[PDB]
Amino acid sequence: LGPQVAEGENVFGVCHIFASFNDTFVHVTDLSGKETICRVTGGMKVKADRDESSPYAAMLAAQDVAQRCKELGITALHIKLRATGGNRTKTPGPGAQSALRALARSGMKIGRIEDVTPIPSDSTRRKGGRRGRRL
RNA sequence: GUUUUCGGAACUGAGGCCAUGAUUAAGAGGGACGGCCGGGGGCAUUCGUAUUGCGCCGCUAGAGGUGAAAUUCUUGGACCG
């Protein structure tokens, strides 16, 4: 079970670390993007809606996802870090570098680093009011 | 009784003469013309990513939002690629 190749060559999957402030996602996928493997979020580790985006919650989100693909023989990953973008914040969540460091310390290797977050040319109306979030 | 002259008006045709007759071109304005310039205006056409909805595939029980939660969507398979 796995790619029938010599271990000196490094196979490639792509992970899409969708970092936000509600939670952080780690969604490893093959190089096509079509047939995905496993989606170990940051919220699956701790049972607290406050701690759903903590930098430790992505330390454990990218430790279990480095065991399902190591079970299938994947040794080097492609990283597409993505903040929520669109009309919301285009600055990455705090649980992003921690999910990278847990992927780079669990024996796995990296490929390319690339920032695909949805930025518009220009978009529709923002969620709040004209006077904004009065808080 | 007639007829002139002059007087005084009113109107036309030649000629001479006028040093014959137009103040300049506003560090005022209008209008030409010349090469440019500008997210000026209108009509037609064209491109972009995003958002939302829909079709199919993948892997799966969480996802949304908050100072914290909760109203809300999920194998009448959500979020994610």
Curated annotation (Swiss-Prot):
Organism superkingdom: Eukaryota
Keywords, sorted A to Z: Cytoplasm, Isopeptide bond, Nucleus, Phosphoprotein, Ribonucleoprotein, Ribosomal protein, Ubl conjugation
GO biological process: cytoplasmic translation; erythrocyte differentiation; maturation of SSU-rRNA; negative regulation of transcription by RNA polymerase II; ribosomal small subunit assembly; ribosomal small subunit biogenesis; translation
A GO MF label: structural constituent of ribosome
Any one of the GO CC terms: extracellular exosome
Residues found modified as Phosphothreonine: T117
Pfam family, one: Ribosomal_S11
UniProt name for this protein: Small ribosomal subunit protein uS11
NCBIfam families xref list: PRK09607.1
Cross-link for Glycyl lysine isopeptide (Lys-Gly) (interchain with G-Cter in SUMO2), residue positions: K45, K47, K90
Biased composition (Basic residues): 126-135
Keyword Secreted: no
Annotated organism of origin: Homo sapiens
Modified positions (Phosphoserine) in chain numbering: S123
Entry annotated with the keyword DNA repair: no
Region feature Disordered, mapped onto this chain: 115-135
